[PDB]
Every structure is written in structure tokens, then in C-alpha cells.
Amino acid sequence: MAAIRKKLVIVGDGACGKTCLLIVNSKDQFPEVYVPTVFENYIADIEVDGKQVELALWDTAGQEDYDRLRPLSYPDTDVILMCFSIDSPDSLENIPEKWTPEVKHFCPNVPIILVGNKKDLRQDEHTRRELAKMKQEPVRSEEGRDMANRISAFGYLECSAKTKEGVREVFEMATRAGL
Amino acid sequence: MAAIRKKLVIVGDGACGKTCLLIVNSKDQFPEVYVPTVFENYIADIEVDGKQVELALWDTAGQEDYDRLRPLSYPDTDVILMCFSIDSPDSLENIPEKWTPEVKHFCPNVPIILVGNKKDLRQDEHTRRELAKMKQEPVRSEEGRDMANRISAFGYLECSAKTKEGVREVFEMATRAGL
Amino acid sequence: VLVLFEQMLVDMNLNEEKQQPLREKDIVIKREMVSQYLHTSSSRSAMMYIQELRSGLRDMHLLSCLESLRVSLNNNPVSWVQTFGAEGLASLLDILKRLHDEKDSRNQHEIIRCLKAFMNNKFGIKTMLETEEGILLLVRAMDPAVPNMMIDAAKLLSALCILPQPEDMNERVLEAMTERAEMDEVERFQPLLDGLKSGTSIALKVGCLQLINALITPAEELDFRVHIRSELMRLGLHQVLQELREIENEDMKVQLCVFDEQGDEDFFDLKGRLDDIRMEMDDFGEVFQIILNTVKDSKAEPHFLSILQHLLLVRNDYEARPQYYKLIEECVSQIVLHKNGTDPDF
Amino acid sequence: VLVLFEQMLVDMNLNEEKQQPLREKDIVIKREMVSQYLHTSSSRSAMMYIQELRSGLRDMHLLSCLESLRVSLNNNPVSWVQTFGAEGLASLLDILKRLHDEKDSRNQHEIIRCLKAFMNNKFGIKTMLETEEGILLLVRAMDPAVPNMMIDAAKLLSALCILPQPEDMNERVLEAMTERAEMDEVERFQPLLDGLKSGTSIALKVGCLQLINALITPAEELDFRVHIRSELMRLGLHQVLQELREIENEDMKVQLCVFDEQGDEDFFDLKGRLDDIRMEMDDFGEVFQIILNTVKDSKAEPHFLSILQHLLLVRNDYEARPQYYKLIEECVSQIVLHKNGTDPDF
Ligand SMILES: Nc1nc2c(ncn2[C@@H]2O[C@H](COP(=O)(O)OP(=O)(O)NP(=O)(O)O)[C@@H](O)[C@H]2O)c(=O)[nH]1
Ligand SMILES: Nc1nc2c(ncn2[C@@H]2O[C@H](COP(=O)(O)OP(=O)(O)NP(=O)(O)O)[C@@H](O)[C@H]2O)c(=O)[nH]1
Ligand SMILES: [Mg+2]
Ligand SMILES: [Mg+2]
Ligand SMILES: [Mg+2]
Ligand SMILES: [Mg+2]
């Protein structure tokens, strides 16, 4: 089976859920813990319109202190997943300040999918009370699509790894893009 | 002088100031009146980097009742100016609902410049009091640039014909685009 | 050359006033305009759409096509619309039907948008009026949860009610609302009251009140007019009106004035009918005769009996029945003669 | 093979802890990682930037180039930074200079961003410290009206003050602030108080207070520490602190605690110096001698005289001077010994 294989590297602010997304697609267990990734890579398989297509998943540290480490991962990417947490406007604001200049610098003309994580937190009672304390509110869909247009991404999908909402669609689009 | 001549058609909601913009570039007198355009066209001349370049200006009725009239103007456009009033969120909301589907339908692959008019009203005392009465506020720059990205325009410039702010730059970009 | 120019001006759906400024231009300008018009006659023909609409597309594909058909019905020569004609419409409403049997609304909405564009003009409204399900299908399109489509459908129906040319148009419309309501287990002005509810867009509220007025204004019969007012008023329309009366909105303000004043006049008039009856039927000999002629063997009967039955609950012996009827009478009068009289709680 | 791996880990600016998880991977994974690293060593070299920065670009062109240089200083092997080296820096600060002689800030800001990335590491901070205008130029970068650049510059300066290796770093910094202030007609903690003002982003407030703490904490001398506290306190720092104390912000809360507690301790200590002096100099014979030795022919003199002069305004005759000095003394004590003592209005 001389299957088609494409590289997907995923990046974004520490703790906005880059790893859970990956893991939920594959083994199918949500980790309660939170161990920060330095450098890890998985292989998936995914459907697109009659095709079985291997997907080489490259997971990266979200933390600042690993900035000189990350370009180890970019060399021949076919498609990026760029993430932010929906419970975190700050994590969004980093899309044009940090994550875009970075990705365009190391992977020029690599399609990007802007992805809002932790969708389930949008209507979360404790979350809202907490975001209020800072003169803020969760990310609005509207805000997320406007950003994707601004960085001229391939698109915007939102999801929650915890409930598995919108996930299967996240990876289809990415498969679809690297083509 | 075998000068370069390009067609600029301008469209947008009735009364958001399509005509004043045109007239201010040319004769240089702001009309106090407001006579609604049915169908009019002027010739300008404008600078771009060492060049004198004639600009064929096609002015259109903003009113609904002239919808079957307007496509008379579109036939070989080189660049559109698409307008909304800054004192009018409603006039903005019509950018994707009406003016975009229209322009892409009749002029496909014609560059668009999204233009916010009546900039001077943004910080206008009576305007704000009036927009409040409707649970609204003037257009934010931020809102205007996000829209241009959404309709995938060539860009966004704001201006006020009344004070002549940002005007010369409006027409330069358009000259620049039709090239 | 000015022949074509008339042809053009007719083909652009412009009333007398709108046409004024085009008539004032120089023949030289009029000559460019005939040649633009002659040329531009930027997509597929009528029959090319009608086919797409028959090959049964779905999803983004249907919308993609409907969005484009919307722009044509909207921006082309009225003549194009006539080529689209009875057929286009019939297949547009075909899609709409088959869609409700899924109960995307982006699709239903787009069709409405098309229909709006189609009725935009004299040819359109005529052909829509000859359709079996047109009105009914607009009515099905008033869904509060899909607000903007409700607005569009509402206006389109309001324009209809106010049409003189074919008689009793408001009634055509009302029948459609009636029909659908029997078709669910639901009250016929339910969707309207629902759209008046607070926290629906002002635009939704306005056009709701607008349809209510559109149903009532054009009616020639006082009876119809006091009748349907009372139905709404029974269902709490007065209370839903109160928090609207403080919205600073030019349109909302206009419909409340039309509504209120309708009430005063209608009911000032009913009172004046009373004054007549009071002269005609001044004793039970007149009253008894009316009943036997006018109520007795009609579908009004069981309801009438039931009222008389409630009016004679008191024992005949009761030492104060005069005082009791003087009272019942004020209530009954309010119920029948005050314009917010059917109110559950005055 | 594990040799390269050390080389790699050094080149990536990682402390001991950060390095832990990379040390735990299988040699097979360690082998991929050396070959990624060996390969990737996605833009121009050091010298190719240094030239662009010398050919004097302007506008979008400068930014475009600075934005890219930012990403390299930030994301490349520490070794790349060393190639950029003393020169890159010197020309970076060259641009910065020439820019202020225009007083776009997008450009000034980007340079700072670069500098931040450059100092990011041991080599960087060293080379920055050897520069003539580095510190001064960061200080010039604290402009309240351009808030985010103020934040970045502030932190960068705060990191400096806390450096042990070269002595009295806080003082290096403070001198730069002093210098610029003489250079305008302005008070040296003016920009800091300005950024504490309400209606500036919380982020701006925090880092303002952070620099204040950074200037004071590391100082070995009580004197310096009570001194500069009082300067701020004189200029109303207490009042600007009050409405901050209600902001629910984890960082803002931490700086207030550091600040407050600094105050208590510093001033508990000054009081304990008083207790000593009270034993050493228990009469005017000791006092007079100190003055003549310690104040008399120093720049402290005119200010000291002026105080004695104010203390002897009362006529000698006055029937209540004891009562008057018992009072003046409480004031003076508060001025010198309470940590918000220099306050214009206690
Ligand atoms: N509500 C909610 N929480 C989630 C979701 N996904 C992850 N989390 C939680 O938020 C944290 C994010 O975990 P992780 O997936 O490791 O994020 P990461 O971005 O890979 N981390 P790093 O930046 O260090 O690589 C964890 O505590 C996790 O349990 C989600 O979809 N919804
Ligand atoms: N404050 C302000 N008012 C303006 C400005 N430009 C136009 N106006 C006013 O707003 C109205 C708009 O006039 P006009 O230029 O004819 O707009 P239009 O869009 O061409 N009209 P139509 O849709 O009917 O063609 C006039 O009353 C005009 O005086 C502007 O820059 N600022
Ligand atoms: Mg992770
Ligand atoms: Mg006009
Ligand atoms: Mg009358
Ligand atoms: Mg101590």
C-alpha cells in the first residue's frame, strides 16, 4: 500500500490544548494530567473521499523557552495547524504577534488552519466568572474567523477535545489542505 | 500624450457619500445639498510614481430602486471603490449582504477597495448620541479592516470628504490597483 | 433612438418619479445608455438556471447557485425575469417544499430572497398570485428562530394584503396562516406574538406589527376588523405592546400609531352601531326574533346558547339580581366595546 | 553521537530543568534530532542582515526587514546570535538613534523586540552591557503613549537591575534615567508614575511597579533604599498606588506585596539606626562635631543650613517653644521615618 503521507506540524500557546487534540484523534483517551510537550511525533490515518491517507503528526512545545528548539520540526511541512484556546483571548492575540511571523518565516506558502480549542469552555460557568475578573470574555466565533482571514489561513474550525466536538472535521480539512 | 486610462466604478449605500468623494478629488467644492445620483461619469488625473494617468470615474445610484440600472456601469471596470459610511453600521453590514455578491457577479476578478467615508463623524457629538438611541456606535477602524479581509479586497482606507482627510490616498490606491 | 430608451426604462422597474432624472439627460448621454443596455443583454440565461434547479443540487452547491440566481432576478432587465417566468418560480417553490420535509436554512432563506426579487415587480406579483402554494410557503417561512427570513417573508406578505387589484387579499393571506396553524397544534398569531417578544431584533418586532396592521387596515368589514383585533388582544397583545412603546425607533413608532388609531376608530364605530341596534331592537320581541332567524340553526348556535346559559346562573329568587345584571352588563360591554377588551387581565 | 546532542542543547538556550525531558529520550530519537539540527544550519545569514541594516532602509522596508531579523534572533541557534555579534547590535542601536532625531514607532518597537531576543541569553546581555548607549537607549524607549514598547523596555531594564555579576547594575540603569531627565525639563520617575496612571493597560502598570522594585531590591545600602523610595513618595506614589490595590491581577498583586514589605523592612531598620545614633550622639558636643566634619564643607551644606534656618523661625522669647518643638519633632520624625512620609498630603 504505497499510501500518500503528508506532514502536519501543530503550534500554539502553551496549554491551549495542542497535544489533547492529537491524542484524541488517535488512541482516544483524554489525559486528565498536563505534561507540557517538548518534542513528540505521531502517525495517524484519516479518510478523505475514498482515500486512506497516512498523516505524520509533529507536536511542538508551546512554551517560549523552547523557541530555538521548534524549528527542528518545520523542515518539510505540508500543512500547519495553528491553535489558540477559546477560554483565552490572550492566547488568540498571539496569533499575529508571535505564531504567524514564525510560521511564515520558516514555512513560506505552507497552508495554515486556524483552530479554536476548548470550545466547551465558551459556555463554562467558572471560566466566564474568571475572565470577567480581567475585563474580558471568551473568544467569539466571529473573532476567530476574522483572525483567520487576517493571517490568510486556509480556514477556521473550532473544537473541544474534551467532548470531541468538531475534531474529525479539524483533521479532514488539514488532510484536504496539504493536498 | 497617449496616457494610460483606467475605469473606476464606485458603489455603496445611498447617502454614504460616494459622490462627494469623487467631486472633492476634482472641482474641489463640498456640496451642502444632497442630490442622489442616478448615473454620472467624470474624468480625473492622478499621480503615481512619475506618471500622469487619466482615471475614468463612473458614479452610481446607491438606492435599491436603481438595481436594474446599475449593471449598465460595470462592463469593463478595472477597479472598484466600495463604500460605507462610518456613521452607519447598517451601511457596513451591506458590504457582504448586497454590494459584494453584486460586484463579484458582474465584475469577477476586479480588485476592490473597501472605503470608510465620513471619518469626521466618528468623533462627532450629535452622531454618537443618535447612534446610541439604536443600541449602536460608529464604525471602528478595526471593524472596517476586518471586513476588507473578509471580502478579500485590495485594501481598506478611511476618509472624510468634508475635511479632505485620507482622500488623495484613496485614489492613489485605486490607480495603483487597476494596474 | 428615444424608442429604445423607453423600452430600457420600462425594463428597469422604475416608477414615474424615479424616471424623472433619466429623462432630463442630453440625447448624447441617452445614446451611450442605449448602447450599454443593448450590449449587456454577466452570467447564465434563464433556462440555464432552471436546469440547475431541476438537477436537484444540495448544500453549498444549492446555495452557490441560489446566491447567483438571486443577483440576476435582482439586477437584470425585468424581461429576464419573465423568461424565468412561471416555470422558474414553480421549481423554486418545488425546492422550498422538499426542504421543509427536512424539518440548511441558508438555502430556504436564499429562495425567499429570490422570491422577493421576483415580486419586486408587476409581472412577478401576478405570477406568484396564481401559484397554489406561494402564499402558504411564504407563511411557512415566518420562523422566529430564523429571524431575518421571517422579516423578509413578513414584508412580502404585508405588500400582498394591501393589494386592491385582486379582492380580499388579506384574507388569502390569513387563510394561509389559519391553514398552517390547524396543521400544527398551534394558535395562528403565535409566530407573530413570538417575534414581538423582547430580545428579538427590533427589525423583527417592527415587521411583525406591520403584518398585523396589513391584515386589518385594508379590510372593508368592521366585523373582520374588530374580530381579529380581539383575537390578538385575547392572546395578550396589549401586554406585549407595552415595552415596545419606549423603543426610540422611527418605524416601530409608526406601526404603534397605526395600530392604536385603528383601534380607536374601529371601536368608536362599533359603539355607533350599538346606538343603532338600541333603536331597532328595543324589546325582547325584537330580540327573540333575531335569535330564531340569525342564530337558531347556524354554527353560531352552540356558542350563543353557552353564553345565555352563563348569563342565567343566578337563582331567580336572589334579592339583588338587578344590581347583579347592572354589573354583568358593564363587563360584557367592556368585552365587546373597548379595544383591549378581550384581555385576560384588564 | 551524544556529543553533538550536548552542542545542540547548549545552542538552544535551555537551563538545566528545561533540558531534563530532552535527556530522557531514546538514542534513536536523539539521532533524528541531531540530524534535524545539523541540516537546519530558513532565511539570510548574519552578515546579510548587517548589510541591510547599513544600507539605510526606511518605512515598510525597514520594518519588513526588522520583523524578519526579529524572528531569527529569536528562533535560531544561540550561535547565530554570536555571529550577529557586537556589530549587529551596534548598527541596531545606530538605527534607534537616528530614529529619535525624528522626535514610525513600529520600527523603534521592532528593534526593541530584536534586542529582547538578543538579550534572551548570556552572550547577548554581556555584549549589551559593553555598549555605550544600550542602557540609555532602552530608557529612551519607555514612552507611556507607546505602551507596549514601554512594557518590553521596562522588563528588559528590570532584568538588568537584578544582575549580580557586574556590580551596582541598578545604579547603571538609574543613571540613565537620571541623564535623560536632565536632558528634558522633567522629573526622572515621571514616565513610571505616568504609566501607573489609571486607564493605561494593566500590563503597563505592572511592569512600571516592577522596575521600581527592581531599582530598590538589589541595593546593598539602606540609604539608597530609603532615599529613592522617598523621592517617589514625595511625587505622590502613595496616591497612585491606592486604586491599583483593587485590581484582581496575579502579577499586580505580587508587586504591591514586594513594594509594601520593602517599605516596612527598610524603615523598621532606619528606626533601628536611630536607636544607635541616640546612644552615640546624646548631646550638642557630639552633634556640633558631626556637622563640622560631615556637613560643613560639602555639597550637603546649603541644604542643611536651610533646614536649621527653618527650624529657628520662632522667636526665642516665645512662651511655648518647648511645646512647639515637641510638635515639629513629630513632623520631622514622620518625614524621615514613616515609609510614605515624604507625601505632600498625609
Ligand atoms: N475544557 C477543555 N480542556 C482541555 C481541552 N484540551 C485540553 N484541555 C486541558 O487544558 C490543558 C491543555 O493540555 P495540552 O493538550 O497538553 O496543551 P498543549 O498546548 O499541548 N501544551 P504545551 O504547550 O505545553 O505543548 C490540559 O490541562 C488539558 O486537560 C479541551 O478540549 N477542553
Ligand atoms: N460628515 C460628512 N458628511 C458627508 C461627507 N460626504 C458627504 N457627506 C454628506 O452626506 C450626504 C452624502 O452625499 P453623497 O455624496 O451624495 O452620497 P451618495 O452616496 O453619492 N448618494 P447616492 O447614494 O444617492 O448616490 C450629503 O448630505 C453630504 O453632504 C463626509 O465626508 N463627511
Ligand atoms: Mg503539549
Ligand atoms: Mg451620489
Ligand atoms: Mg371612520
Ligand atoms: Mg532585614
Coordinates of C-alpha atoms in Angstrom, one line a residue, chain D residues 135-136 139 167-183 188 215 224:
Chain D
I135 CA 21.0 51.2 28.6
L136 CA 20.4 54.8 27.8
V139 CA 15.5 54.1 28.9
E167 CA 28.3 45.5 40.4
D168 CA 25.7 48.1 41.1
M169 CA 23.6 47.4 37.9
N170 CA 20.5 49.2 39.3
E171 CA 22.7 52.3 39.5
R172 CA 23.8 52.0 35.9
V173 CA 20.2 52.0 34.9
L174 CA 19.2 54.8 37.4
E175 CA 22.0 57.0 36.0
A176 CA 20.5 56.5 32.5
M177 CA 17.1 57.5 33.8
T178 CA 18.7 60.5 35.5
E179 CA 20.6 61.6 32.4
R180 CA 17.6 61.6 30.1
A181 CA 15.6 63.6 32.8
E182 CA 18.2 66.4 32.9
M183 CA 18.1 66.0 29.1
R188 CA 13.2 61.1 36.4
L215 CA 15.7 49.5 41.3
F224 CA 19.8 54.4 48.7

